[PDB]
């Protein structure tokens, strides 16, 4: 049978911490009451309606002397070309050989898993009579995150700082993907240039299969200048001297 | 026949037969070479002409009163014109 | 369209406290690339294979002088009776007029709800061309 | 005849001020001594060497039993297939019907002309017997300029300023494409943000055919922060208060 592909939307926190989620899927299963045979041997009859074709040709007049032949799925066998009396299949499928069942799959998203990574559930796809079921393949879709951008195992963020912080040193705090508060300290007497990047080592994403190893966090600094007229002209001399 | 049956597919396995007036004889069922009729009608046996009728409305005429111009309607081959 | 019925298994604690749960369902949606038309007007062709029937009659010999005629869904149009070139529909449906999409429904189970109670999501069932979706 | 295309490399100053330049080109002209006839009527003889083919097949042995046939241009008629005795053409062409002459073209580059603009000299290409000459087409190629980048009729430049200049106002001078010194003044109490753009109106490129109208000059400001440790920590408080 055909494999079923489903996108699983995951956050950066889900990918960092790991996540177990329950996915509800509706799939075709072989009808438990007739084991797909549709019905008993000799219960399966040619649909009289479409004469086994699955489809009926309906004639719609558009104008006198203009008829449109439309092919419609046959109402009496729903396209199957066969009819099975309810008593021979069950009061479930309806000569269809399958029933829609709701299955809950438990999905494990491991630490450090990547965008586009596949989680396969073997033989979990749609069942059909005389067909071995395909797989359900979940495709991991990473959601955009407001603070962090992921590059492989590394994380990138933009942090806004004032001119005073950029020149005189600073301390700031942010929330990481595990919910820890990280305190970043930059010593006085070192300058942060506008757009410059600094690194916080080991505060990136965990490696897949090796969650003890992590990438790095790169912080791009956006240096905010003070507004128009922030200082009296008389004090510009004192600033120049410094 | 004057008409052609054109088949329009609506979907694979749904065909609509539409009757269209035949492009080649404009519904007449016959064709006359231009040289045999003229460069006017076109095997049509008639031409559209613009006629000016002078209409006299007499004093005291009533709403719904009829003014008839005899034989002034459309001409057709082998047909005496209406009014 | 037909309504889709799904059993939602709930515990007594879920029914007592109330519960919000996310249900992932796969449904047929109209193909965004051809708006169900399947393809452009005149892109829809009769399947040559089954001559518009959706099905092919395959002859299986059981023994010399015993042939079984089996009706199989036509491989070339997957039962539709029509074929649409990929370029006329998209590289998605495949002349099918629909695509399987995964939708997440947020389901609210209120306090005191009963066994057999129905929660309806209107128009959320399978879409088909020229058919208003069921619930 | 075929048109001759020549790239003319022009600077922004050339395009702003206008430029007259002399271009020396070598072209084929009809031989003044035989008027292309090659020679007198009956002076033109089939080349005996190549029997009128212009080419000779030379056999080079590569190994015994391996011969390479190479087609070479015929030495005796230089590919023409004909030979004209020197006395019948002149001591110039040599039965060639043309001579290489050096022509100087005066090229006018007007104010506001654009990259890729064509200057055509009609009938100035190579002459051949019984062929009307093609044109010489000069294609203007704008050279990169160290300070200014041109966009249509507008000019762009990057100007570096200190943090003090960005906050307290500044005055600077630059040399324009006409060689004028432009003094740009920015008033005190207005801030220049890093990477912000300002405009000096009417200091762009002149419009082609309308050199009284000019585009604008856009100045991107690159704000230079002071280096690491530029101020004593004790003075950081005084800076914060301002
Ligand atoms: Zn069944
Ligand atoms: Zn049927
Ligand atoms: Zn489609
Ligand atoms: Zn088919
Ligand atoms: Zn000569
Ligand atoms: Zn020769």
Numbering used by the authors:
A (entry chain C), D (entry chain G): 43 to 284
B (entry chain P): 95 to 177
C (entry chain B): 43 to 177
Which sentences did the original study use to describe this structure?
A preliminary 3D reconstruction without imposing symmetry yielded 9.2 Å resolution and revealed the same general features observed for DNAJA2wt: an oligomeric structure in which the dimers associate in longitudinal filaments interacting laterally (~100 Å separation) to form a helical arrangement with ~32 Å pitch. The helical structure could also be visualised as disks of five DNAJA2ΔG/FR dimers, separated by ~76 Å. Docking was excellent with regard to the DD, CTDI and CTDII domains, whereas some movements were required to fit the ZFLR into the central cylinder of the tubular structure. Despite the clear role of JD in DNAJA2 oligomerisation, no mass in the 3D reconstruction could be attributed to this domain. The linker (13 residues) that connects the JD to the main body of the cochaperone in DNAJA2ΔG/FR is flexible enough to average out the JD during the 3D reconstruction process.
Common to all of them is the presence of the J-domain (JD), an α-helical hairpin structure of 70–75 residues found at the N-terminus of A and B classes and anywhere in class C. In class A JDPs, the JD is followed by a flexible glycine/phenylalanine-rich region (G/FR), two homologous β sandwich domains (CTD I and II), with a Zn-finger-like region (ZFLR) inserted into the first one, a dimerization domain (DD), and a C-terminal domain (CD)8. DNAJA2 has a potent holding activity, collaborates with Hsp70 in substrate remodelling and has been associated with other functions. We explore human DNAJA2, finding that it reversibly forms highly-ordered, tubular structures that can be dissociated by Hsc70, the constitutively expressed Hsp70 isoform.
